[PDB]
XYZ file of C-alpha atoms in Angstrom:
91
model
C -11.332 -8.746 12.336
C -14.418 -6.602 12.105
C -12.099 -3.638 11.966
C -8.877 -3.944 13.627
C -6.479 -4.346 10.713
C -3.871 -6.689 10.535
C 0.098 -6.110 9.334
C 0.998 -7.802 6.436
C 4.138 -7.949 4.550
C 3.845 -7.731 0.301
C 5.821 -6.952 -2.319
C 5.196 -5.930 -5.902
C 7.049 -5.611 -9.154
C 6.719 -2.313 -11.471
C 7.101 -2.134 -14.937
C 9.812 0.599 -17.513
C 6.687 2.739 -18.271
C 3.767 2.396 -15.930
C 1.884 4.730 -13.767
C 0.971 2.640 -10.611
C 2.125 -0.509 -9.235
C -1.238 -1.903 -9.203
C -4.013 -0.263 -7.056
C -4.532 3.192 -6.152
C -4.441 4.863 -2.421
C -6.849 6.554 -0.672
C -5.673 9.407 2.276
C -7.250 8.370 5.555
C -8.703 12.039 6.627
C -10.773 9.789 9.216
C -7.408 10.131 11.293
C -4.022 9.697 9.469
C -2.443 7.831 6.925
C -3.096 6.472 3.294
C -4.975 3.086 2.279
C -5.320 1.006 -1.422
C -8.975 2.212 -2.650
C -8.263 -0.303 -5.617
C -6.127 -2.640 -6.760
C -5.840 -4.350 -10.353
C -8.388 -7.873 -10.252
C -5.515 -10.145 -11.313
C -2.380 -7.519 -11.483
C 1.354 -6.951 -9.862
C -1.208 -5.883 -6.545
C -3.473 -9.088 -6.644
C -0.112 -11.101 -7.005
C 1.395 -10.013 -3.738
C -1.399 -10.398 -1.858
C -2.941 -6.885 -1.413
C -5.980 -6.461 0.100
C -8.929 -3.437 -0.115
C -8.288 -1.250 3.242
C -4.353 -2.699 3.312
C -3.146 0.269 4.948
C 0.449 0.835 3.822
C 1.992 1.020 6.860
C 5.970 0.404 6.224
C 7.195 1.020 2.898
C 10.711 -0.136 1.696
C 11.330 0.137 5.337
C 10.140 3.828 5.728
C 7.670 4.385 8.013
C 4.740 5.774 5.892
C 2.279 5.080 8.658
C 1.777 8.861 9.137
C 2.080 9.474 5.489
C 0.211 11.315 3.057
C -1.617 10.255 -0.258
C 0.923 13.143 -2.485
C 3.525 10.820 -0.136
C 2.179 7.055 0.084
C 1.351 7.804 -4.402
C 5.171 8.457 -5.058
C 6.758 6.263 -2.341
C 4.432 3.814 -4.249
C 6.031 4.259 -7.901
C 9.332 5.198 -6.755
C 10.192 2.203 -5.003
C 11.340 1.111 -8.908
C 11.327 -2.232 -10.056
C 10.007 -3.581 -7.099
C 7.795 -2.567 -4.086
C 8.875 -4.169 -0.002
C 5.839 -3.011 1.769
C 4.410 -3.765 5.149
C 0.407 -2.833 4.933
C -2.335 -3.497 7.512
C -6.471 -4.560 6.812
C -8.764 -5.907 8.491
C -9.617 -9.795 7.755
């Protein structure tokens, strides 16, 4: 709990004409990966149940564990209309 994150699943819904699907990522250069360093109070992000540190560990199935922010940012808007992800924080 203190630090040991724990999986997840959430899924979002994107809008014909926005830029995010509701919180930004961060790259984790503290070993690998990418986690949300914000998500919208009250938005697509806050609706599915994402939470600061929910590192995005399966996307739409692909395993973006190892992924980078320039891969975990477009993986993130081009999941379309919706987003199927499977992220891990700590509670």
């Amino acid at each position: 709990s203190p630090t040991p994150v724990e999986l997840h699943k959430v899924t979002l819904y994107k809008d014909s004409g926005m830029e995010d699907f509701g919180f930004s990522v961060a790259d984790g250069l503290l070993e690998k990966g990418v986690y949300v360093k914000n998500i919208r109070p009250a938005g697509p992000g806050d609706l599915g149940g994402l939470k600061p540190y929910d590192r995005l560990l399966q996307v739409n199935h692909v395993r973006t564990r190892d992924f980078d922010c320039c891969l975990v940012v477009p993986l993130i808007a081009e999941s379309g209309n919706k987003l199927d992800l499977v992220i891990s924080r700590n509670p």
